[PDB]
Every structure is written in C-alpha cells, then in structure tokens.
Chain A
Amino acid sequence: IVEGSDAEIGMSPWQVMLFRKSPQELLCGASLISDRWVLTAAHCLLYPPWDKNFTENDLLVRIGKHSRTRYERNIEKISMLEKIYIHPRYNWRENLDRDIALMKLKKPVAFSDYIHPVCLPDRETAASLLQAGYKGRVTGWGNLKETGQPSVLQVVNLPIVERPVCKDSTRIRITDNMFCAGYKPDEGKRGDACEGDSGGPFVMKSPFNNRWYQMGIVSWGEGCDRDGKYGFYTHVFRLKKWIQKVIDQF
C-alpha cells in the first residue's frame, strides 16, 4: 500500500495472508468470508506468464495478523488448504478478467477479536455503494512504493472512479468485472495498492446497516500511485453467482 497508514488493531479482522511454505514468504493478501472459505485473486494462484501455478500443499493461510513478518503467537491462526477453486473464465492470457479464486480450509477457523468474516454484497448494496466518488478501503502488506515493505498491515481509503476515466487511463481492455479507484491528479490526496497487496479486499461500510462489505479484490495496476493511473479491482458482486455455486457445491 502506497501513502497509507498503519492499521489499528482489529481494524480488518477478515484480512488473510497467503503464505508460501518453502521458501517461507508472503505471496498475497486474501479475505475471510466464513469459517472455512477464503477469497483471493486468481493471479495469486495461477499466472502462467510468470510460471506461477500453485497447488494446495504449496501454501498456507495466516489469519488474524497485524505484523507482516512476526509470528503473532496466541493471536494469528495458521490454516492448511483443502482445495483451490479458480474462476473457469479467469483470463490470465489478456487482461486479468474475472480475477477471482476461492480457497477452502482443511478445518474451520475459530473467530476471535482478531479473526472475523467480511460480508459479500447483495445486488442493492452493490448498486447503492458502487458509485463514482464513494470511498472504499484497501488493506495489505505489499510494497510501500512502486520502486520498501511495512512492519504492520497498511490501510488506505480511496474513491471509486468514473468508468470512462478508468478506461481512458490505460491501454488495457477494461471489463464489467473490474472497477478502478484512486484520486485524480487535481485532487491532491494520493494512495494506491501495489505489488504484494494482490488478492486483498476493497471494503465499504454500509451506511444502511453499518456492516463492512467486500466490493473488490486487489487485481492490477500499472506501477503504483502514479498520477493519472488508478488501481483496478475485481468486481465481487458481478462474480458472486460463481462464488455461491462453488460454496453450495463444495
């Protein structure tokens, strides 16, 4: 996260770290959506241009964390994966369309003050809140600048951007399964996700029921926090029928 701040304790209790077993290193962010399901970006698990194709036994999830590098004894919980599910129409070949994946845990995680699931949006919460200028919140342990890494989880609040501005900021083909967020050059304020924040959540707090909803997944960008560029996020509601099909079936 570029130009963010340290998270408060328990601020993002659905935060998940995807962790490589060997060598031991951070791979991505992710989010807790129930006691046994974690949501992330497909490119965290599968990206053939970079020879990335992880199996379940390659990975762990670490839940309840604040410090990036510490083993947070008596606070974090470490879970093994039963199964990875990648969207069948995830487009790693072109533009990261449908950049979404689910991971089922081998055993349910116990909730605590530090471990709690985020909600997924219904159609009406999504329609109400996915509007240009409305702000969401992105969290992660990724890079602090484009070109280094934080002691603790970082947080930044960023406005959703009008779709024509998103489209006109890039040569990549933008789809309805994406949205973009960030400040415009003339707005002064700054901030962005960055490499290492992949897979983490873009959340909004509903003013109707005062619950946090995950509207996006950190997906891609061109550099980090560049003027005139915006961060791109997987549109969770647009892909929710797939999420529900996987959870119902498996």
Chain B
Amino acid sequence: GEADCGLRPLFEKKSLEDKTERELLESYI
C-alpha cells in the first residue's frame, strides 16, 4: 500500500510516539 506506506497503525496513525524515535529525530541536524 504505497500511498499509506510508513505510517504505523499503532503509532503515526493514532499520533502516538514510540519510546526511542525521538533519538532518530535529534540526530537529523
């Protein structure tokens, strides 16, 4: 399902953050 790819039902789709994704974001400097 390309259109909906990469958006996890239990996380992005419900605007919930997993416990370590912020570590990735903080590295994108």
Q: Do chains A and B touch in the complex (CB under 8 A)?
A: yes
In the complex, are the beta carbons of A9 and B10 less than 8 A apart? Answer: yes
Given A155-B20, A157-B24, A204-B24; A111-B5 close (CB under 8 Å)? no
In the complex, are the beta carbons of A133 and B5 less than 8 A apart? Answer: no
Provide the residues of chain A in CB contact with B25, threshold 8 Å: 205, 207
Q: Binding site of A, secondary structure by majority: helix, strand, loop or mixed?
A: loop
**Is residue A223 contacting chain B, with contact meaning CB distance below 8 A?**
no
Option from B4, B11, B19, B20 in Cβ contact (under 8 Å) with A10: B11
Distance from B14 Cβ to chain A, minimum over Cβ atoms (Å): 10
Option from A117, A120, A129 in Cβ contact (under 8 Å) with B28: A129
**Is residue A13 contacting chain B, with contact meaning CB distance below 8 A?**
yes
Which residues of B from 1 to 29 have beta carbons under 8 Å from A? Answer: 1-2, 4-12, 18-21, 23-25, 27-29
Option from B8, B10, B28 in Cβ contact (under 8 Å) with A212: B8
Distance from A113 Cβ to chain B, minimum over Cβ atoms (Å): 4
Q: How far is the CA of A112 from the CA of B1 in the complex (A)?
A: 12
The interface on chain A, measured as residues whose beta carbon lies within 8 A of the other chain's beta carbons, has a size of: 35
Q: How far is the CA of A117 from the CA of B29 in the complex (A)?
A: 27
Distance from B6 Cβ to chain A, minimum over Cβ atoms (Å): 3
Q: How far is the CA of A204 from the CA of B4 in the complex (A)?
A: 16
**Is residue A159 contacting chain B, with contact meaning CB distance below 8 A?**
yes
In the complex, per-residue mask of A96-125: 1 if CB is within 8 Å of any chain B CB, else 0: 000000000000000111101111100000
In the complex, are the beta carbons of A10 and B29 less than 8 A apart? Answer: no
In the complex, are the beta carbons of B7 and A211 less than 8 A apart? Answer: yes
Q: How far is the CA of A113 from the CA of B27 in the complex (A)?
A: 28
Chain A: CB-nearest residue to B19: A8
In the complex, are the beta carbons of B23 and A157 less than 8 A apart? Answer: yes
In the complex, are the beta carbons of B27 and A118 less than 8 A apart? Answer: no
Option from A13, A135, A137 in Cβ contact (under 8 Å) with B8: A13
Extra A-B contacts (13), CB below 8 Å, given A8-B10, A34-B1, A35-B1: A10-B10, A111-B9, A116-B1, A116-B5, A117-B5, A118-B5, A119-B5, A119-B6, A129-B28, A134-B24, A159-B27, A210-B7, A212-B8
